[PDB]
Amino acid sequence: PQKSKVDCNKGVTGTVYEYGANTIDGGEFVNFQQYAGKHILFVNVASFCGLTATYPELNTLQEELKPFNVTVLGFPCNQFGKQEPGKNSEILLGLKYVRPGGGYVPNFQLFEKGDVNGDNEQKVFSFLKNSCPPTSELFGSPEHLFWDPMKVHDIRWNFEKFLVGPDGVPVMRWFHHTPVRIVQSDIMEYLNQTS
């Protein structure tokens, strides 16, 4: 049965603090210690997915969880149905004018497009993906999956999500189709549990 969430593995293999990424608007390298001590929600995103419509809900999550020490980070990725064809210089424009359109702007940082699976995957995602069980028994249909090789712990689709705790260690990982409101309420439950 499809679970909404998995808890990440009980040990540690390091933290997110040895990694970084370039901002989509500026190419500026950001090492993730710029978020040292914050709870971080890593989301791989795309612009021509049904789940692209969840961008505004992500804003709501960010806005309502910002007073509680939560930062959302977005990673565009073209590996799932080729649903992020735009260049880095095109992605925010498309979000604003095409889909979601209507003037939509993320209220959280997006980084440069890159891979999250395969032999050129960004290293932070090697760490995240292998710190947690995969989100689903179902790997999917490989005609839609544009990377090599394929592994149990691969990200399954656009808008998969990881929560990383204030020590830089992953805590939980959501199925891409889990409603954003349930991600938000799961995060608050975690926050209230760990005081």
- The span from the CA of 38 to the CA of 69, in Å, is 5
49 in catalytic set: yes
- The span from the CA of 90 to the CA of 106, in Å, is 14
- The alpha carbon of 4 is separated from its chain's Cα centroid by a whole number of angstroms, namely 15
The count of residues in the chain is 195
Q: Are the CB atoms for 29 and 61 separated by under 8 Å?
A: no
- The span from the CA of 48 to the CA of 158, in Å, is 10
β-pairing, 5-7 vs 39-45, is unpaired
Give the active site residue among 8, 49, 77, 132. Answer: 49
CA-based nearest residue to 28, from 101, 92, 109: 109
Question: Per residue in 75-108, is it b (16+ CB within 10 Å) or e — as a string?
Answer: bbbbbbbebbebebeebbebbeeeebeeebebeb
Residues with catalytic function: 49
